[PDB]
Amino acid sequence: WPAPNEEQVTCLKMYFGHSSFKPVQWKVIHSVLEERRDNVAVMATGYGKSLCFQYPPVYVGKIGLVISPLISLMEDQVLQLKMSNIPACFLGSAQSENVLTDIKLGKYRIVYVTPEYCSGNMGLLQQLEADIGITLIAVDEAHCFRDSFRKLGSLKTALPMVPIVALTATASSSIREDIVRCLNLRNPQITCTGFDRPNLYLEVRRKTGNILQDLQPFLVKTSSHWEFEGPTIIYCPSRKMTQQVTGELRKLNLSCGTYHAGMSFSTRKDIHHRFVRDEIQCVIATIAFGMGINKADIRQVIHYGAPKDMESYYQEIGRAGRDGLQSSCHVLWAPADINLNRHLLTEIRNEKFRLYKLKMMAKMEKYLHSSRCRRQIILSHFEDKQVQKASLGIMGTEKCCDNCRS
Ligand SMILES: Nc1ncnc2c1ncn2[C@@H]1O[C@H](COP(=O)(O)OP(=O)(O)OP(O)(O)=S)[C@@H](O)[C@H]1O
Numbered sequence: 001w002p003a004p005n006e007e008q009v010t011c012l013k014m015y016f017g018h019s020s021f022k023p024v025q026w027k028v029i030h031s032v033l034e035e036r037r038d039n040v041a042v043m044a045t046g047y048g049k050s051l052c053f054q055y056p057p058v059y060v061g062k063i064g065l066v067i068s069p070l071i072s073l074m075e076d077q078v079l080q081l082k083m084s085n086i087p088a089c090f091l092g093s094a095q096s097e098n099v100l101t102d103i104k105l106g107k108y109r110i111v112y113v114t115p116e117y118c119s120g121n122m123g124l125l126q127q128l129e130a131d132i133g134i135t136l137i138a139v140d141e142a143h144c145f146r147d148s149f150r151k152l153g154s155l156k157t158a159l160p161m162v163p164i165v166a167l168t169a170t171a172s173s174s175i176r177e178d179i180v181r182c183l184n185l186r187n188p189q190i191t192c193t194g195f196d197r198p199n200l201y202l203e204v205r206r207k208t209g210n211i212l213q214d215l216q217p218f219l220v221k222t223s224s225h226w227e228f229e230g231p232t233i234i235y236c237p238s239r240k241m242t243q244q245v246t247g248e249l250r251k252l253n254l255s256c257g258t259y260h261a262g263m264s265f266s267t268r269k270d271i272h273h274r275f276v277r278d279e280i281q282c283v284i285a286t287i288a289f290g291m292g293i294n295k296a297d298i299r300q301v302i303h304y305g306a307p308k309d310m311e312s313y314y315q316e317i318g319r320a321g322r323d324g325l326q327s328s329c330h331v332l333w334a335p336a337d338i339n340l341n342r343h344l345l346t347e348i349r350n351e352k353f354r355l356y357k358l359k360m361m362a363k364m365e366k367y368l369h370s371s372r373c374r375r376q377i378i379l380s381h382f383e384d385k386q387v388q389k390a391s392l393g394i395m396g397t398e399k400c401c402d403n404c405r406s
């Protein structure tokens with residue numbers, strides 16, 4: 001494996017602020033830049049998946065195409081890029097003609113587009129590659145599904161020289177093969193970023209049948225006022241449970257924001273941004289709240305109800321402690337929550353992924369009932385080459401998990 005040169009490291013520091021590339025980030029970046037190779041990267045939350053597709057077009061001064069149906073989330077990525085002096089935009093049906101002319105003139109490094117727009121404008125994409133050059137096409141599977149990827153199968157046929165970086169939130173081997181055939185990838189480099197988040201203390205406790213009684217141990221009294229220790233996310237299995245929990249917390253005059261897909265994108269965006277600006281201390285959310293939170297100091301994550309499955313749990317708690325400081329992740333559960341989760345696993349159309357999720361769910365109930373190290377149970381899914389000294393140094397201590405405490 002080759003090392004990045006001074007031009008490469010200086011570009012990383014100037015436009016991204018990082019002094020070094022993480023091992024898997026450099027494997028993906030180098031393979032796209034030098035070998036023009038398709039990549040499939042199994043991405044664990046918190047690693048740094050964005051640099052894999054944002055950095056290459058910035059370094060070569062060309063276009064990087066980012067595909068996702070989530071337009072609602074593209075503004076924050078575009079706005080963040082423009083703040084780091086990286087020209088970026090959203091390209092769509094409702095975009096002005098002057099933005100499209102500026103894309104054709106090579107004024108934008110990162111162009112965010114939907115799968116739907118791609119399908120209807122393949123000729124524009126071919127013109128863009130011939131005249132300007134497309135460094136890469138990035139596709140996040142977590143942002144979508146096979147029906148949305150069916151429109152993207154013509155990408156490798158129309159742009160054979162443009163490498164595709166497909167990012168996925170699951171280690172499922174059948175999903176990996178589905179994304180390879182859906183996008184017609186050619187000899188893709190397969191990488192994975194599974195890692196321990198050692199600054200996350202883990203704890204599981206049983207629900208008492210009373211919301212305030214369950215959440216009271218997490219609250220501190222600052223002079224006379226009840227509040228959380230720091231920025232907190234409470235995950236609920238339903239929109240109705242987010243409303244119940246919020247209503248109870250507001251009886252204590254706690255600074256809250258509810259977040260779920262029943263609220264408009266405008267109301268949701270408002271809650272998210274109030275959390276980032278620290279105007280609200282707690283966000284009570286369904287799993288709809290998670291992607292691109294852009295909050296480094298989440299101190300506490302509470303799953304108010306058993307998590308759907310072990311893999312989902314691993315990904316959701318990864319939104320805590322992005323600053324590297326001490327954070328806590330608590331699960332509050334009852335055996336009746338498990339009965340409910342089981343029924344929702346039959347509503348998976350891929351029987352190969354449904355069985356994968358069923359093994360992940362069986363691991364979840366074992367994890368919840370266990371007397372063993374929580375971190376050891378989660379890390380038992382990774383190869384030893386990914387478990388480092390920092391993780392071993394934390395396991396067996398008070399800062400690891402409830403079962404490692406005395
Ligand atoms: N080379 C790097 N050096 C240091 N930190 C990095 C590096 N690459 C990424 N990170 C950090 O890794 C964290 C996660 O970044 P990403 O995974 O790209 O975030 P994201 O794409 O917004 O994903 P979500 O939606 O928040 S999971 C951030 O704190 C990054 O700044």
Ligand SMILES: *CC(=O)Nc1nn(Cc2ccc(F)cc2)c2ccccc12
Pocket residue numbers: 042043044045169170171192193194195310311314377378379381382
């Ligand atoms: C190589 C690699 O990172 N593998 C990987 N395996 N999983 C599955 C998993 C399930 C539950 C859990 F607690 C941890 C891991 C994942 C998930 C996410 C990213 C990578 C991987």
Ligand SMILES: [Zn+2]
Pocket residue numbers: 372373374375376395396397400401402403404
């Ligand atoms: Zn432990």
